[PDB]
Write a protein that binds this ligand. Structure first.
Ligand SMILES: [Mn+2]
Ligand SMILES: [Mn+2]
Lengths: 293, 288
């Protein structure tokens, strides 16, 4: 159950990855197979429909396995399709956790800040180097959770009820602008500094998110490697705290923090330069790859 | 030129305050006077249309030559926040009155946003250190990046009032201000959005806050450490500002945390923030 926002011949569509060489255009698939048009035009709208959207999508996928002559019109090879961020335009800033792995800091309450929606970009998209502004761009591979069901004062016990699914984020950061403005917003909210994707995997496919593992490579070289079980604050705890006096809405994105291995962490620090390739891998979400322009 | 989001007979509409007891429903006024329907349903969408929307609005207002129908008494209309649902978090400046060399910048979630006359939740189980902050807010009317200070005002639509209500304990607890700044209903905004053509000298704007009638805050925009053009310049240095983006430009001294015994907000407290000629933003703290 891997959802995505794809683009093909100047149409943007909500897709479902089938086997990982094919993407189904859900609106067009619904139209041929069920002669219905109910599936909305964006993944955030779909997320708001909840479990029934996903059930509908499961059924479309199984009906697409049964033979018919018009596959080419709603089933496309991934090679031919540009993947945008699963949610190209969040309705609010991405909620980011700071220092949530033990050796990254090297915290009794979560440190929480945000990235502007203007940061959001997709798999394969160029990240601006922003050579005026900063010479301390840094990578941060993270597990992102997407809220699927609005709520406030959500307890830990039912936190996963409010989760839709998981994606990858690269929380790219200007380290000098962080220090300069004290609060992290400006250094966290440069244009194109939030690669997201390549897909949004529904939680029904990830029964054990504690066993999720994030891995970051820079120009092929492994930099980060952490496990979600090592998080200081678990996903349920973050949801409990975040929602204590605030409403979490369908489509809200929480970046749950980066492990150690960031560029600032090294003596000589390793900041990003033009041409650098960043690949972040979390199975079974896949790999989020971006290049510095 | 005072724009507003009003509610009447269960419908939300983009309005234009006429005298200051009447509000014109722009969509319905367009429909009667020109028999056209082009004006979008929200003020943020209207802002994105730019100068042409404002010109259109001027013309509708003068074409009040004899009303039903599309002209209503303010008495009859609920005023929401000019922009009920921002497309991103409200950009907030930290200490900008009184000594930083660079602006301290953070955000409030859109879920904070509420209107004139709306109840702010006390959030008694989360905090007992709710505090008020009266501020001048500037609304971007034309997107841009690397905006210079010289043409900063070209990217400004207009001005409103914000009350940047803050939980002071949650601020300290989470270091970064997001949590303590983004409790539900803690961003009263309005009562109107005055177009810049009606202000044009925002340096002379004066903010005043009263709590249960008692004057607490009183600052002038000329005393701001970082002026509006400078904030726009630095915010947009590597980042795109979009039409509809709201910048809260900081509060003067007089906040509740500032007093020995500190004065935090409790159930029943009335907060009135006045900036002429935008008017008065009034809210009450709700029950437990
Ligand atoms: Mn991070
Ligand atoms: Mn403030």
């Amino acid at each position: 159950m891997k959802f995505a926002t794809g683009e093909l011949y100047n149409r943007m569509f909500v897709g479902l990855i089938i086997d990982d060489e094919k993407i189904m255009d859900l609106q067009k698939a619904e139209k041929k197979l069920f002669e219905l048009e109910t599936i909305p035009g964006s993944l955030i709208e779909c997320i708001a429909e909840g479990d029934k959207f996903v059930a509908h999508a499961r059924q479309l996928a199984e009906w697409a396995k049964k033979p018919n002559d018009e596959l080419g019109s709603f089933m496309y090879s991934l090679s031919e399709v540009k993947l945008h961020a699963p949610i190209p335009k969040p309705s609010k800033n991405i909620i980011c956790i700071g220092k949530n792995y033990r050796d990254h800091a090297i915290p009794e309450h979560p440190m929480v800040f945000t990235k502007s929606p203007v940061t959001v970009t997709g798999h394969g998209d160029i990240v601006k180097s922003h050579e005026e502004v900063t010479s301390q761009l840094d990578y941060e591979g993270e597990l992102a959770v997407v809220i699927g069901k609005s709520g406030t004062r959500i307890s830990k016990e039912d936190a996963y009820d409010h989760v839709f699914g998981y994606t990858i984020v690269n929380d790219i950061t200007a380290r000098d602008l962080q220090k300069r403005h004290k609060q992290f917003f400006i250094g966290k909210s440069l244009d194109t500094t939030c690669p997201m994707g390549p897909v949004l995997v529904h939680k029904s496919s990830i029964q054990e998110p504690e066993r999720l593992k994030v891995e970051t490579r820079v120009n092929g070289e492994l930099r980060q490697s952490g496990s979600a079980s090592d998080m200081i604050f678990s996903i349920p705890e973050l949801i409990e705290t975040l929602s204590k006096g605030m409403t979490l809405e369908a489509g809200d994105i929480i970046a749950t923090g980066t492990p150690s291995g960031v560029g600032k962490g090294f003596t000589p620090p390793k900041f990003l330069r033009s041409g650098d390739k960043i690949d972040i891998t979390i199975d079974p979400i896949g790999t989020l790859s971006n290049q510095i322009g």
